[PDB]
Amino acid sequence: SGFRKMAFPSGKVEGCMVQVTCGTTTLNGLWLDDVVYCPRHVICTSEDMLNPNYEDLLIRKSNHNFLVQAGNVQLRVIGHSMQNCVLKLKVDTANPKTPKYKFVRIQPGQTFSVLACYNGSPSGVYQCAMRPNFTIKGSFLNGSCGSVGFNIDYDCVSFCYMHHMELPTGVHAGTDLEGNFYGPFVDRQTAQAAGTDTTITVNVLAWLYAAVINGDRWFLNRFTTTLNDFNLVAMKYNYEPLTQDHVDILGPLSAQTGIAVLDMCASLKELLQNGMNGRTILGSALLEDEFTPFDVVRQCSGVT
Amino acid sequence: SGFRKMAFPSGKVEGCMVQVTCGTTTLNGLWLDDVVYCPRHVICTSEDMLNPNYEDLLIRKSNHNFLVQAGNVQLRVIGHSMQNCVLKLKVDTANPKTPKYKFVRIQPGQTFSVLACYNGSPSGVYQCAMRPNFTIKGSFLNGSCGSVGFNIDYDCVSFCYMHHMELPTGVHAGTDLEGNFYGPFVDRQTAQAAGTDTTITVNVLAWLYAAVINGDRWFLNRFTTTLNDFNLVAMKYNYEPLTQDHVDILGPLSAQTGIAVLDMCASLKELLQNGMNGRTILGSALLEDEFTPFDVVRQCSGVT
Numbered sequence: 001s002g003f004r005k006m007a008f009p010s011g012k013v014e015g016c017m018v019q020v021t022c023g024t025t026t027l028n029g030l031w032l033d034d035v036v037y038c039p040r041h042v043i044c045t046s047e048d049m050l051n052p053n054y055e056d057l058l059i060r061k062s063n064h065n066f067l068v069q070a071g072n073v074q075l076r077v078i079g080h081s082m083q084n085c086v087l088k089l090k091v092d093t094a095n096p097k098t099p100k101y102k103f104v105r106i107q108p109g110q111t112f113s114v115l116a117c118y119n120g121s122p123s124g125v126y127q128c129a130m131r132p133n134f135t136i137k138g139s140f141l142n143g144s145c146g147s148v149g150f151n152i153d154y155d156c157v158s159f160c161y162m163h164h165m166e167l168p169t170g171v172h173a174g175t176d177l178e179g180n181f182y183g184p185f186v187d188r189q190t191a192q193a194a195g196t197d198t199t200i201t202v203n204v205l206a207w208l209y210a211a212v213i214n215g216d217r218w219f220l221n222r223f224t225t226t227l228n229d230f231n232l233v234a235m236k237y238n239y240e241p242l243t244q245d246h247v248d249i250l251g252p253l254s255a256q257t258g259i260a261v262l263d264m265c266a267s268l269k270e271l272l273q274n275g276m277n278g279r280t281i282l283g284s285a286l287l288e289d290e291f292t293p294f295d296v297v298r299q300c301s302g303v304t
Numbered sequence: 305s306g307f308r309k310m311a312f313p314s315g316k317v318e319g320c321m322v323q324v325t326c327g328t329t330t331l332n333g334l335w336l337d338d339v340v341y342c343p344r345h346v347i348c349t350s351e352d353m354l355n356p357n358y359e360d361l362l363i364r365k366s367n368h369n370f371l372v373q374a375g376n377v378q379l380r381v382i383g384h385s386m387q388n389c390v391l392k393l394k395v396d397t398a399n400p401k402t403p404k405y406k407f408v409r410i411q412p413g414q415t416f417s418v419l420a421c422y423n424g425s426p427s428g429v430y431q432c433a434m435r436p437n438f439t440i441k442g443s444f445l446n447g448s449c450g451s452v453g454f455n456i457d458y459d460c461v462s463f464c465y466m467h468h469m470e471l472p473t474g475v476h477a478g479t480d481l482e483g484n485f486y487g488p489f490v491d492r493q494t495a496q497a498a499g500t501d502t503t504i505t506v507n508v509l510a511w512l513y514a515a516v517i518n519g520d521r522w523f524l525n526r527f528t529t530t531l532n533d534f535n536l537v538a539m540k541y542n543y544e545p546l547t548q549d550h551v552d553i554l555g556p557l558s559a560q561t562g563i564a565v566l567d568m569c570a571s572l573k574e575l576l577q578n579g580m581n582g583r584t585i586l587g588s589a590l591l592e593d594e595f596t597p598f599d600v601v602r603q604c605s606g607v608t
């Protein structure tokens with residue numbers, strides 16, 4: 001019992017972190033096999049960041065300008081290429097600590113762990129969600145660029161995020177491991193609209209199931225609703241519309257608890273319309289949306 | 305910017321986890337140098353747990369009855385001893401992945417990361433506080449016993465907690481790495497009073513400083529208070545009395561923000577007396593007490 005915002009164990013990712021320096025800029029890189037991946041803005045100076053012509057800036061760099069250090073050992077750079085907003089530095093040595101891995105592009109609403117790093121050194125690990133507006137609400141300071149987000153399935157690490165920047169609003173933006181930004185963002189120091197965010201409805205419902213499983217049940221009521229009625233409420237409260245695909249993903253939790261998905265929707269509708277009346281659910285005084293239905297099943301069943 | 309409930313990177317601890325089996329019971333062990341540490345209740349059957357005579361139960365066991373497996377490799381047990389509520393199994397091989405480590409007994413109100421494990425395999429990592437009543441509000445299921453809590457300072461892991469049991473109330477109890485329980489708990493399947501818990505005042509104040517640093521400032525007011533006046537409020541709301549030792553520990557945050565500790569106490573007094581009025585601080589609708597002043601400084605400065 002108990003339910004916590006749990007991150008994946010970070011060991012397999014810690015073994016991949018390196019420091020990349022180009023000129024006077026230092027950030028983190030991810031060393032997998034004989035390639036180091038890092039944000040392409042490592043080649044910029046502060047004056048370049050306002051409107052960088054990355055193609056021109058990269059042309060002024062050679063393999064020997066990219067200093068890559070894995071703890072104490074220096075890596076020899078034998079090639080460099082830019083792919084979208086990431087740089088790929090080919091090195092002469094395969095990382096002996098490379099776990100089994102994949103590069104994935106996650107969907108908005110999905111969750112992942114972030115290993116926050118500075119100067120190639122891990123500082124902490126936390127779990128978060130990719131917001132529906134393709135931002136993440138992380139904890140990142142200057143020097144954290146290149147820190148990565150990932151999920152683990154048994155012995156396979158699926159890397160899904162590389163950190164690039166903080167928007168003027170204090171939220172975070174980054175790319176998949178092919179260097180494609182999540183959302184409309186560009187890697188320039190310009191104010192950029194993130195666009196309307198919404199609460200991840202299917203995740204709130206999964207977390208209400210986790211609450212029932214752990215004994216927080218005060219919010220269960222004698223009501224039911226329909227997908228149509230619930231979605232009118234979701235619209236009013238800036239929640240994502242619930243679909244049959246979301247109801248299907250909640251099947252395991254509905255089966256485990258015996259609470260029909262539309263009955264849990266009626267509990268969520270009442271919580272949206274009335275608030276929590278000074279009460280808490282799983283130690284929270286707000287409706288939590290950073291746990292997917294898969295996260296709830298994994299945590300509630302102790303998957304390793 | 306951004307502030308998250310961040311755990312230490314778990315890699316150094318992952319390399320120490322093993323599975324320990326004795327008879328039909330399987331739990332986690334911690335392999336450091338040539339010793340494996342685990343909860344002594346690995347020697348119990350279900351019938352023993354109601355009132356175990358651990359001395360008698362252990363006398364029926366020999367070195368070859370303790371099966372210790374580090375992933376795929378089997379460890380050879382050459383000695384066993386019980387120290388308080390932990391068993392120490394001497395093995396013939398030093399763990400090659402033993403980090404620099406210490407065993408520490410943490411104080412109530414201090415925080416640490418937990419690497420939740422099942423069958424010697426890591427499942428997740430989360431940060432928590434040792435409550436003032438010496439319980440922890442973790443996320444643990446059957447088989448998680450032997451999972452450990454720790455802090456990291458550069459390359460040194462200070463182990464402070466080993467998980468033993470879940471109280472009938474769903475909260476958790478465990479020991480230091482010498483097998484001494486935190487709190488009044490005994491390793492028996494009997495209902496046990498945890499005693500009155502309180503909110504960790506110095507941690508709430510540290511988190512309010514973290515909020516100001518990250519731009520959540522709506523709770524700052526034109527008021528001040530004294531330690532005496534604040535402590536009358538703390539008493540009414542079941543908060544730990546604030547001492548000059550706590551004010552001293554908050555010195556760095558007070559210096560960084562220019563907000564005197566007693567002025568932040570007046571903000572906290574107003575939040576206790578009026579609530580949050582439907583607003584949030586650092587994404588929370590309640591006053592958070594799982595960040596120490598050291599945690600806030602570390603996270604806000606990006607220590608690795």
Ligand SMILES: COC(=O)[C@@H](C(=O)Nc1cnccc1C)c1cccc(Cl)c1
Pocket residue numbers: 041046049140141142143144145164165166167186187188189190305
């Ligand atoms: C001058 O460079 C910066 O401030 C970084 C950035 O956001 N770093 C940064 C990242 N995360 C947290 C805090 C900080 C500070 C920057 C800005 C704009 C565009 C890009 Cl691709 C990069």
Ligand SMILES: COC(=O)[C@@H](C(=O)Nc1cnccc1C)c1cccc(Cl)c1
Pocket residue numbers: 001345350353444445446447448449468469470471490491492493494
């Ligand atoms: C029958 O044994 C148990 O249930 C364990 C225990 O709390 N495990 C356990 C631990 N954490 C979460 C869930 C579970 C289930 C037990 C009970 C009482 C005393 C001790 Cl020292 C151990």
